Design a protein around this ligand. Structure first.
Ligand SMILES: O=c1cc(O)cc(CCc2cccc3ccccc23)o1
Length: 134
């Protein structure tokens, strides 16, 4: 319990850096990159017992994942990859690893001041996405 208290809430994207290049590195095609890159999603994080839910309400694609820390699950990403995901807590950072087609990407989510900072890494390419409370 209380494991993710500081993550819970409704968050809105306020800034992004290098997201197009991250998406390229992931293999996202041109048209999806353009439409995905415009979006300013709402990320809604909640906890009920051991189950964490992360919803994204977006003009591009709505998604919802529910999971237990350390327990692999199936995820269809907003860009339509069918991945196997595992999310753990490492030193207060949510670490989300996605595996598909022999590839891997990691999404880290951390609280920094009044922000929720999302770092997306594919090989040598990082994108930083900053969310504030909605
Ligand atoms: O938790 C968050 C918040 C973010 O801002 C970004 C991401 C990375 C996953 C993602 C989300 C939505 C669209 C995408 C399109 C292409 C590739 C990955 C995508 O996760």
């Amino acid at each position: 319990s209380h494991m993710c208290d500081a993550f819970v809430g409704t968050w809105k994207l306020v800034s992004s850096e290098n997201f197009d290049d991250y998406m390229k590195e992931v293999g996202v095609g041109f048209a999806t990159r353009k439409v995905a890159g415009m979006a300013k999603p709402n990320m809604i994080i909640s906890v009920n017992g051991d189950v964490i839910t992360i919803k994204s309400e977006s003009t591009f694609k709505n998604t919802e994942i529910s999971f237990i820390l350390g327990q692999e699950f199936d995820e269809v990403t907003a860009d339509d990859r069918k991945v196997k995901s595992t999310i753990t807590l490492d030193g207060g950072v949510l670490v989300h690893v996605q595996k598909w087609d022999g590839k891997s990407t990691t999404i880290k989510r951390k609280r920094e001041d009044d922000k929720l900072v999302v770092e997306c890494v594919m090989k040598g390419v990082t994108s930083t996405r900053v969310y504030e409370r909605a």
